[PDB]
Design an enzyme around this catalytic site. Structure first.
Site, PDB file in Angstrom:
ATOM      1  N   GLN A  74     -13.341  23.294   5.248  1.00  0.00           N
ATOM      2  CA  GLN A  74     -12.430  23.667   6.333  1.00  0.00           C
ATOM      3  C   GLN A  74     -12.304  22.503   7.320  1.00  0.00           C
ATOM      4  O   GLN A  74     -13.346  22.002   7.782  1.00  0.00           O
ATOM      5  CB  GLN A  74     -12.930  24.948   6.993  1.00  0.00           C
ATOM      6  CG  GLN A  74     -11.766  25.659   7.636  1.00  0.00           C
ATOM      7  CD  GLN A  74     -11.727  25.596   9.138  1.00  0.00           C
ATOM      8  OE1 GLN A  74     -11.942  24.572   9.795  1.00  0.00           O
ATOM      9  NE2 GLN A  74     -11.430  26.748   9.692  1.00  0.00           N
ATOM     10  N   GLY A  75     -11.079  22.106   7.641  1.00  0.00           N
ATOM     11  CA  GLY A  75     -10.839  21.034   8.592  1.00  0.00           C
ATOM     12  C   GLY A  75     -10.605  19.711   7.890  1.00  0.00           C
ATOM     13  O   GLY A  75     -10.157  18.763   8.560  1.00  0.00           O
TER      14      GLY A  75
ATOM     15  N   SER B 229      -8.560  19.825   5.298  1.00  0.00           N
ATOM     16  CA  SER B 229      -7.180  20.127   4.867  1.00  0.00           C
ATOM     17  C   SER B 229      -6.214  19.012   5.225  1.00  0.00           C
ATOM     18  O   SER B 229      -6.216  18.572   6.361  1.00  0.00           O
ATOM     19  CB  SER B 229      -6.705  21.366   5.571  1.00  0.00           C
ATOM     20  OG  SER B 229      -7.247  22.491   5.008  1.00  0.00           O
ATOM     21  N   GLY B 230      -5.382  18.650   4.267  1.00  0.00           N
ATOM     22  CA  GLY B 230      -4.323  17.660   4.476  1.00  0.00           C
ATOM     23  C   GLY B 230      -4.793  16.242   4.312  1.00  0.00           C
ATOM     24  O   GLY B 230      -3.929  15.392   4.238  1.00  0.00           O
TER      25      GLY B 230
ATOM     26  N   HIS C  46       0.179  23.525   4.293  1.00  0.00           N
ATOM     27  CA  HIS C  46      -0.556  24.592   5.004  1.00  0.00           C
ATOM     28  C   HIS C  46      -1.036  24.125   6.384  1.00  0.00           C
ATOM     29  O   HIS C  46      -1.478  24.964   7.156  1.00  0.00           O
ATOM     30  CB  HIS C  46      -1.634  25.212   4.135  1.00  0.00           C
ATOM     31  CG  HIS C  46      -2.886  24.418   4.037  1.00  0.00           C
ATOM     32  ND1 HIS C  46      -3.186  23.599   2.958  1.00  0.00           N
ATOM     33  CD2 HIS C  46      -3.951  24.387   4.875  1.00  0.00           C
ATOM     34  CE1 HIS C  46      -4.377  23.072   3.165  1.00  0.00           C
ATOM     35  NE2 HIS C  46      -4.873  23.527   4.327  1.00  0.00           N
TER      36      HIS C  46
ATOM     37  N   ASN D 235     -14.936   8.726  15.890  1.00  0.00           N
ATOM     38  CA  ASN D 235     -15.353   9.893  16.672  1.00  0.00           C
ATOM     39  C   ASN D 235     -14.094  10.488  17.300  1.00  0.00           C
ATOM     40  O   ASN D 235     -13.474   9.875  18.180  1.00  0.00           O
ATOM     41  CB  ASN D 235     -16.380   9.467  17.698  1.00  0.00           C
ATOM     42  CG  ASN D 235     -17.017  10.684  18.310  1.00  0.00           C
ATOM     43  OD1 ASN D 235     -16.326  11.607  18.696  1.00  0.00           O
ATOM     44  ND2 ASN D 235     -18.304  10.699  18.392  1.00  0.00           N
TER      45      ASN D 235
ATOM     46  N   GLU E  79      -9.014   6.655  14.328  1.00  0.00           N
ATOM     47  CA  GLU E  79     -10.129   7.494  14.795  1.00  0.00           C
ATOM     48  C   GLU E  79     -11.388   7.261  13.978  1.00  0.00           C
ATOM     49  O   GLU E  79     -11.329   7.133  12.768  1.00  0.00           O
ATOM     50  CB  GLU E  79      -9.795   8.976  14.680  1.00  0.00           C
ATOM     51  CG  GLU E  79      -8.793   9.410  15.724  1.00  0.00           C
ATOM     52  CD  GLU E  79      -9.392   9.582  17.118  1.00  0.00           C
ATOM     53  OE1 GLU E  79     -10.486   9.034  17.346  1.00  0.00           O
ATOM     54  OE2 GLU E  79      -8.758  10.254  17.982  1.00  0.00           O
TER      55      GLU E  79
HETATM   56  N1  LIG Z   1     -12.379  22.348  -1.064  1.00  0.00           N
HETATM   57  C1  LIG Z   1     -12.205  22.773   0.280  1.00  0.00           C
HETATM   58  C2  LIG Z   1     -10.906  23.406   0.390  1.00  0.00           C
HETATM   59  C3  LIG Z   1     -10.515  23.932   1.725  1.00  0.00           C
HETATM   60  C4  LIG Z   1      -9.379  23.596   2.384  1.00  0.00           C
HETATM   61  N2  LIG Z   1      -9.228  24.392   3.487  1.00  0.00           N
HETATM   62  C5  LIG Z   1     -10.232  25.310   3.512  1.00  0.00           C
HETATM   63  C6  LIG Z   1     -10.482  26.322   4.432  1.00  0.00           C
HETATM   64  C7  LIG Z   1     -11.588  27.108   4.229  1.00  0.00           C
HETATM   65  C8  LIG Z   1     -12.420  26.893   3.118  1.00  0.00           C
HETATM   66  O1  LIG Z   1     -13.464  27.725   2.971  1.00  0.00           O
HETATM   67  C9  LIG Z   1     -12.158  25.921   2.192  1.00  0.00           C
HETATM   68  C10 LIG Z   1     -11.050  25.082   2.400  1.00  0.00           C
HETATM   69 CA   LIG Z   2     -11.864   8.475  19.019  1.00  0.00          CA
END
Ligand SMILES: NCCc1c[nH]c2ccc(O)cc12
Ligand SMILES: [Ca+2]
Length: 223
Positions: free
Chosen positions: A174-175, A177-178, A40, A54, A52
């Site tokens: 959020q963020g 991910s991956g 995704h 900061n 990385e």
């Molecule tokens: N457990 C967090 C999962 C997660 C991954 N990407 C996301 C995007 C939005 C969210 O509300 C949640 C997520």
């Molecule tokens: Ca940096």
């Protein structure tokens, strides 16, 4: 990461930031030339940022390397997030050191009750928005398949596991991910999905990396 702690600079040396003008996903360095992330997170024009802490300041340990090729799992389904895994080849090999290091793929699937480390630069709030600049960490257990299925009826495939806390308050977000879920020094999961972040009875759902080791190894061998 909600309810985590500041990892500390370069304490998670396999953590990568995927950058398309801004950080948008995490990933894991699995050898000098390949990154694993979530399907995704796919987009064109990825720069992989290694070393990385900061993500808004150049601190001196960074390597910035363009992706040459992205390979989404052949069976990824964006509606169900089944097979939420992708490989990214780097244009050139990373220089591996104490602060930029690969994480081992698993030889076995981790059991429920295993403690893992989840990391990322995602949102730190369960309602509203605060994005940290420095890497956040969370220790969380793998939950039983039955508790995961009870949390997300009809949505958990054999390629997913739940980790975190049914009481809420601590989760990926959020963020994140991956990014990696590492247990006993092996990559066992990828931050995939959930119902919001850190909600009661809604733990995070992770791609079950142990199911993909043959695909990963055969894909790296031929690309
Ligand atoms: N457990 C967090 C999962 C997660 C991954 N990407 C996301 C995007 C939005 C969210 O509300 C949640 C997520
Ligand atoms: Ca940096």
């Amino acid at each position: 990461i909600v309810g985590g702690y500041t990892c500390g600079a370069n304490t998670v040396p396999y953590q990568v930031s995927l950058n398309s003008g801004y950080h948008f996903c995490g990933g894991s360095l699995i050898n000098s030339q390949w990154v694993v992330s979530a399907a995704h997170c796919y987009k064109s024009g990825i720069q992989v940022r290694l070393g990385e802490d900061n993500i808004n300041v150049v601190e001196g340990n960074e390597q910035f390397i363009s992706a040459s090729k992205s390979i989404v799992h052949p069976s990824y389904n964006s509606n169900t997030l089944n097979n939420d895994i992708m490989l990214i080849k780097l244009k050139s090999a990373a220089s591996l050191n104490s602060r930029v290091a690969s994480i081992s793929l698993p030889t076995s699937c981790a059991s429920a009750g295993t403690q893992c480390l989840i990391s990322g630069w995602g949102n730190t709030k369960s309602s509203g928005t605060s994005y940290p600049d420095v890497l956040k960490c969370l220790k969380a257990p793998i939950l039983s398949d039955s508790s995961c299925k009870s949390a997300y009826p009809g949505q958990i495939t054999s390629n997913m596991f739940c980790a975190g806390y049914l009481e809420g308050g601590k989760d990926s977000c959020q963020g994140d991910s991956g990014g990696p879920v590492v247990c006993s020094g092996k990559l066992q999961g990828i931050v995939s999905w959930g119902s919001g972040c850190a909600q009661k009875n809604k733990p995070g759902v992770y791609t079950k990396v142990c199911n993909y080791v043959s695909w990963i190894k055969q894909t790296i061998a031929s690309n």
